[PDB]
């Protein structure tokens, strides 16, 4: 150690609900920037986040079409809902049901909001229908994922299943997707000069900045444990 001057995360200011600015105490150089980069990699890599897994919409059953009153295509509605963000409870694989009718603007409020699911942008656009007779009603299963996956990736898992009506899509499952690791020499006066690090996280809101940071650091430490062997 030899006066290691072990740092500590401090002045963690949540810049937004899906973003935060967290600092830490000073530490010796040559690793602090490296520590930040490794943390950004691990959190970006092992990013377990709640996303949309499977969908089922009454009017749109199979692939790509247009129905009276409808506005955005099946994949276009897929993106539009993907335009909203999902945070799940400890159990993932939750199922949301977006059902609505009328002539009003599309908002994220008119979906099946349960205890296992959190919705942030209650002002997310879902292509408001233009017909009063039009009545949107789609039930979608939302799961927590850790990484991106092809849409064709799940082809064999459900051969008989996922028939026309049942919908499956590709995903990224990166909870953060925006985090920069800046190392600055500061916060060391009594002992040898050390670098004060500030972390500006920006996530999708599925995970807290501090919890995700701790998880990434634990993963990094666990990996470094194998380096002993």
């Amino acid at each position: 150690v030899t006066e290691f001057l072990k740092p500590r995360l401090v002045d963690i200011e949540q810049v937004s609900s899906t973003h935060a600015k967290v600092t830490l105490e000073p530490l010796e150089r040559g690793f602090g920037h490296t520590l930040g980069n490794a943390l950004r990699r691990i959190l970006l890599s092992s990013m377990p986040g709640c996303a949309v897994t499977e969908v089922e919409i009454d009017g749109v059953l199979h692939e790509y079409s247009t129905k009276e009153g409808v506005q955005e295509d099946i994949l276009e509605i897929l993106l539009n809902l993907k335009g909203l963000a999902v945070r799940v409870q400890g159990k993932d694989e939750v199922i949301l049901t977006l059902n609505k009718s009328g002539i009003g603007p599309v908002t994220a409020a008119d979906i099946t909001h349960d205890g296992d699911v959190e919705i942030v942008k209650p002002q997310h656009v879902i292509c408001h229908l233009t017909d009063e007779n039009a009545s949107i009603s789609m039930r979608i299963k939302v799961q927590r994922g850790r990484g991106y996956v092809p849409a064709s990736t799940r082809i064999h898992s459900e051969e008989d299943e996922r028939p026309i009506g049942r919908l499956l899509v590709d995903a990224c499952y990166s909870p953060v997707e925006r985090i920069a690791y800046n190392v600055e020499a500061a916060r060391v006066e009594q002992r040898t000069d050390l670098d004060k690090l500030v972390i500006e996280m920006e996530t999708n809101g599925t995970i807290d900045p501090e919890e995700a940071i701790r998880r990434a650091a634990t993963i990094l430490a666990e990996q470094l444990e194998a380096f002993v062997d």
Binding site: L61, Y64, S65
Partner: protein, 99 residues
């Protein structure tokens, strides 16, 4: 005999017929993986005699008689994906209009 699309492909896998609509063609919007068969036309095939061996074959399995050559439409190799829609044109004098 004309090749009529009725999904009545002789010696056809059940899943193959499970996709084709009753019109020989399939439902709409349905996705095809690999060389999936969509519209099963039944091209007529030649006939034969009593053929007591084939008489016994008909008495056992039957329903084939080697009379309908399979003119079924199966997906091309390296071709698999969503069928956006389809178009069917029938000559004057033929109006099955199943779909």
């Amino acid at each position: 005999g004309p090749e009529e699309i009725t999904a009545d492909i002789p010696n056809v896998g059940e899943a193959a017929l499970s996709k084709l609509d009753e019109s020989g063609i399939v439902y709409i919007g349905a996705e095809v993986t690999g060389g999936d068969i969509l519209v099963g036309k039944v091209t007529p095939k030649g006939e034969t005699q009593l053929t007591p061996e084939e008489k016994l074959l008909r008495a056992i399995f039957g329903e084939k008689a080697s009379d309908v050559k399979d003119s079924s439409l199966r997906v091309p190799n390296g071709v698999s994906g969503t069928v956006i829609d389809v178009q069917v044109f029938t000559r004057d004098g033929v109006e099955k209009d199943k779909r």
